[PDB]
Every structure is written in C-alpha cells, then in structure tokens.
C-alpha cells in the first residue's frame, strides 16, 4: 500500500535532507512493503547514500526483477552494476591469494588439525544447517563409536551417517587426480551414500513428480547430463574456482532431481570442485543458516552474486582461521 | 589324527556289551557313550553304537540321524550302510505323516474365523518376526527394544546404531513380502522380488550393498552373470509347475537352503533366505513361520547336515516351528 510509499516521498526529501531520517523512513517502510518496486528503489539509493553500493545495487535487481522495464531502475543499476562487478572480481582475487597464502607448509599436526577436525566440522554444519539437533560432539560420537544418542531421532543419526559415507567416497575416488572426469553415475552415488540409510528407497534416484518459484519439470536426465558435461568441459577451466562451485551448487538445487537431499548433495559439490582447485575444506556454517538460504532465493530471481559472495566469505574465512590456528600453535 | 584313550575304552567296552539283561541296560551303555560322544563327536564308531542305542529306545529318527552322519564322515563305511538300510523307510513313513499333520493343523488354521484379537496377534506378529530373525544374526536388541523401535517409534540410546537399522530394514522387507509378494495378482515369483526384499533388509543398516549382487580377461570364480544366472536358475525352479507337487513346507527348506548356498550377497543372506522360505509358507496359506533363537543352535545344526546331504533335519526343523507358529495363533482362541 501506498502509505509509506507516499511516505517513500516524505522519505524522499528526507533521503535529500541528509539525515538518518531518511534512514528511519525506509526502514520502517521496508518492514511493511514487500515487491513494491518503487519502495525498492528508493532503499536502493538510501543505501547507496550510506556508501552501501553492492546492497543499492541489489534493491535495484530486485527491482528490477519484479519489475521488467522499470527505467528509473535500468538508469541506477547501469550506474551501480560496474563497480560492484570491479569489487567482486578482487574480493575473489582476495580469497584466493589468502589461498595461495595458505599452501605454505605441510606439517603432520596441520594434517591433524585440518583432516580430523574439519572433518567432524563439516559433518555437523552440513546436516546442521538442515536442521539436525545433534551438537558436534555428538555427531562425533556417532561416527566414532556408532552408539546412540539420547534424544535425538534415529532419522538424525542416519543424515549423520549417509553424509559420513558420501564424504567417503567422494574422498576415495573423486578427489583422486586419476579420477579426472566426473560421471553422472557419481552424482547419483552421491546422493545414494548422503541418503542410503535416512531413506533408502529414494537414495541415488531421480524423482517421478513435480514440486510445488518453481523448479525445473522432469525432462530431467538431460539437465544432470548438461552439469556433467559442463563441468568436464575445458572452458570451465578457465573461470574462477570460487564461481565455478557456486555455479555448480546452484545449478544441481534448480534442477532439484532428487525426492530429498538435494542441499546436501550440492554443498557436497560444491565442496568437491573447489577441494579439486586446491582449497581447504569450505564449511557454510549453520549459524549463517539464514544468509545462505537467503541468497540462494535472490538466486533464483537471476542473481547468483549475493550466493558467490556467501561461499567466498566463508572459505575466505575458513582459511583464515586455519592460518590463525597455525599462528597461535606457533 | 588321535581320539583320547578314554574314546578309545568307552568303544571296547560297548563293543562288549549291550545285552538285555540288568548289569548293563540302557542308559548304563548311554551315559558311556555319550561322554564318548562329548569327547569325540565325529568317530563314526561312537557315531554307530549311539545310533544303536537309540535304536533300541524306539528314537528311530534321531538313530537314522547317528548313521548318517557315520557314513557322511567316513566314505564306504559299510557299517553305517546297513543299519541306514534298515532305518530309511521306517523314517520316510515317519515324516510323511508329520508334514501331514502339520497340513492339517494348516487347514484348521484358515478356518478360524477372523476377529479383532486376531489382528492384535497379526500385528504383534511383525514385531515377532523381525526380532527372532534379526538376534538370530546376532543383534543383541530385545523383543522389547524390538518392539518399543518399530511400533512407538522409539530409540534405545546407548546401544548400536546398525542394530537399530537392521530391525527397521527386516520390518520394512516383512510389509513388503505382504503387501506386495501375496496379491495374488504375483503368482509368479520374480528374480526383483528377491532383490527387492534384500534392498529393503539391508537398506537401512548398509545402503551401498542393498538389493546389489556381490561382484573374465583374468582370472576370476565370480563374476556378476554368472552369480545373477545362478539366481535365476533357483527362481525359475521355484516357479516351475513340477515343483509346485512337492509339499510347501519341503519346497520352503530347499528353497532357503538353494538361496544360502549360492549367497548371492555381501550380506543379509541368512535373513533373506529365512524371508524367502517365509514368503513360500505363506504364499501356500501358512501363517508366518517363526525360527525362533532360542533354537539357533538347532537351526544350524540342521544346516550342518543339509551340507553332508540330508535336508531332511532341516525340513523337520521348519515342520516343527510353523507347526507352533500355526499353534500360537489357535491356542490364543
């Protein structure tokens, strides 16, 4: 409604009467108004007075995106879109000289820190963030000792264990510099070993319906072939690591081709090619739970930007703390 | 390579004896040669006396069983021949009329008349089944674990995450052998009915090897054609209208004992086969047979001797349990 759109414009002369007044404005504007475009773009500029270019940047696609044609939106975005593509190409250079930075020695206890610990990190994150109530510990007493926990149902207990055997064996062949193809027959052991024991009926195959923002009709095969090829394709070679993971995460979730397990499945990915380009382990946190699924739905609006940047501050931040590790360990 | 003395002197002792008179009878002779056996269980000279022995206490089954199994260790021994000779259609006579009893006692099962505790003892029946058949393989939950997993959803902490599974598994495969492999609309028993039943024992507990065969420009004994064709084989037996002449319950141990020796899985033969033999029971109007594990021993003991030849311990083995299974549920009225 146009209450606060009509107050958009007393936030207006409020975005020029320089003040966190303006500010106010739109804030209390944006709790109460959703895919209003204009409402949007004024947020857009608000932000950008606030020196805010990327998240400016963003109001005005989403803009945009509700809005096809929105001129006022086409003219700010045509302003904002080059720097915010200059700042995203060096955060990525950023995250991958800290990368670089990081291959600098091979000690047994940097073996023993990062193998063993992330292992169990990533193990918990990732079931975690779905929304498994296990803690780490116990999700390191079920790998460790295959005992049960009390409190915790036995579907918990089987994420826990499928993710444990699909990160086995994306380990025990994927990772391997012989394995220098990826089939479409590993996807689906993928999924196989992520959801074996939770659901064994539907693990490792393609679902028979359709899911109620839509996702992709089951023409399906032909999409998970068009990933495989465009992941062995040499091109690809040449785009960054980062992007390229992301791509493939988001890729895999649109095409959404199983039943359940389709976030685990690609996070896996994801995980698998930028551990293939010489990173250490990527851990989306779940405590970052609602960014993550947030920017996956600004994905599914046509911007994958808000997700890249997600997936680089995390392995960015991943990597950073593992070097403080070593730092402090002196 | 050498029995202990005492072996030794237990036979020339019974060798010079076992006269009707009161300085020896019976369980004088008996008690001997059962210590003998404790210490020797495999010399097919204790093996014979013992048969005799049990010959002359009118245990006429369990002396046949004596000489088989003398003969089965020791090739030729025309002994054990003769006294087999005797004892063969004595037994044959005798387990013609158990398998029929067993089948009468069939037919008055399915003439009782379907109520609402009958199916408490129906549905508790699942919980039965899968507990016996699972503590048979060796997992250490209770019926009452057993039971509080399948039916309240429950948990029990503290003890093994695949035995949870497993129980969760065979009660998945059971559901599936009723609501799938009995409409009649089957008839037929297809080599994926086999495949589906193990892709939902073992689905839970081990994902990766479920409903999948265990796996030639080398050398190699196995090969997935080959153990895949040798399941066809048993199944196009089982379908075969020659087959279907012989007696369910005989038709159920050889199918049980085709199945566990061709073992055509990493694992979960042993249930499978146990499943198999139940899916053929109850395809001919049987309610579920239950081996129970309190007979474990018993089972394997059968086994044993399947291997030396005779199939006919094992056939009498399940004759007895679906003979009780059937009992469980008429006795309850």
């Given at each position: 409604?146009?209450?606060?759109?009509?107050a958009?414009?007393?936030?207006?002369?409020?975005?020029?009467?320089?003040?966190?007044?303006?500010?106010?404005?739109?804030?209390?504007?944006?709790?109460?108004?959703?895919?209003?475009?204009?409402?949007?773009?004024?947020?857009?500029?608000?932000?950008?007075?606030?020196?805010?270019?990327?998240?400016?940047?963003?109001?005005?696609?989403?803009?945009?995106?509700?809005?096809?044609?929105?001129?006022?939106?086409?003219?700010?975005?045509?302003?904002?879109?080059?720097?915010?593509?200059?700042?995203?190409?060096?955060?990525?250079?950023?995250?991958?000289?800290?990368?670089?930075?990081?291959?600098?020695?091979?000690?047994?206890?940097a073996?023993?820190?990062?193998?063993?610990?992330?292992?169990?990190?990533?193990?918990?994150?990732?079931?975690?963030?779905?929304?498994?109530?296990?803690?780490?510990?116990?999700?390191?007493?079920?790998?460790?000792?295959?005992?049960?926990?009390?409190?915790?149902?036995?579907?918990?207990?089987?994420?826990?264990?499928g993710?444990?055997?699909?990160?086995?064996?994306?380990?025990?062949?994927?990772?391997?510099?012989?394995?220098?193809?990826?089939?479409?027959?590993?996807?689906?052991?993928?999924?196989?070993?992520?959801?074996?024991?939770?659901?064994?009926?539907?693990?490792?195959?393609?679902?028979?319906?359709?899911?109620?923002?839509?996702?992709?009709?089951?023409y399906?095969?032909?999409?998970?072939?068009?990933?495989?090829?465009?992941?062995?394709?040499?091109?690809?070679?040449?785009?960054?690591?980062?992007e390229?993971?992301?791509?493939?995460?988001?890729?895999?979730?649109?095409?959404?081709?199983?039943?359940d397990?389709?976030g685990?499945?690609?996070?896996?990915?994801?995980?698998?090619?930028?551990?293939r380009?010489?990173?250490?382990?990527?851990?989306?946190?779940?405590?970052?739970?609602?960014?993550?699924?947030?920017?996956?739905?600004?994905?599914?609006?046509?911007?994958?930007?808000?997700?890249?940047r997600?997936?680089?501050?995390?392995?960015?931040?991943?990597?950073?703390?593992?070097?403080?590790?070593?730092?402090?360990?002196?």
């Open positions: 409604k146009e209450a606060i759109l009509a958009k414009a007393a936030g207006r002369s409020r975005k020029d009467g320089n003040l966190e007044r303006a500010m106010t404005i739109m804030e209390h504007a944006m709790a109460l108004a959703p895919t209003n475009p204009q409402i949007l773009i004024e947020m857009g500029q608000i932000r950008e007075m606030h020196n805010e270019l990327v998240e400016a940047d963003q109001c005005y696609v989403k803009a945009l995106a509700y809005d096809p044609g929105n001129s006022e939106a086409l003219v700010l975005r045509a302003r904002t879109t080059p720097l915010v593509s200059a700042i995203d190409r060096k955060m990525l250079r950023s995250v991958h000289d800290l990368r670089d930075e990081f291959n600098h020695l091979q000690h047994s206890t073996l023993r820190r990062m193998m063993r610990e992330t292992y169990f990190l990533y193990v918990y994150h990732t079931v975690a963030i779905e929304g498994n109530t296990l803690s780490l510990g116990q999700t390191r007493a079920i790998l460790e000792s295959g005992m049960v926990i009390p409190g915790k149902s036995i579907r918990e207990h089987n994420e826990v264990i993710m444990d055997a699909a990160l086995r064996f994306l380990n025990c062949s994927l990772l391997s510099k012989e394995h220098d193809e990826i089939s479409i027959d590993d996807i689906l052991e993928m999924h196989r070993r992520v959801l074996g024991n939770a659901d064994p009926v539907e693990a490792g195959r393609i679902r028979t319906t359709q899911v109620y923002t839509p996702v992709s009709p089951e399906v095969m032909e999409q998970l072939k068009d990933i495989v090829d465009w992941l062995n394709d040499e091109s690809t070679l040449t785009i960054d690591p980062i390229r993971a992301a791509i493939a995460h988001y890729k895999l979730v649109l095409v959404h081709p199983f039943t397990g389709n685990r499945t690609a996070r896996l990915l994801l995980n698998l090619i930028m551990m380009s010489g990173f250490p382990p990527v851990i989306l946190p779940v405590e970052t739970r609602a960014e993550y699924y947030a920017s996956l739905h600004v994905a599914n609006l046509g911007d994958l930007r808000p997700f890249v997600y997936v680089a501050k995390h392995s960015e931040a991943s990597i950073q703390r593992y070097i403080g590790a070593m730092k402090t360990s002196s």
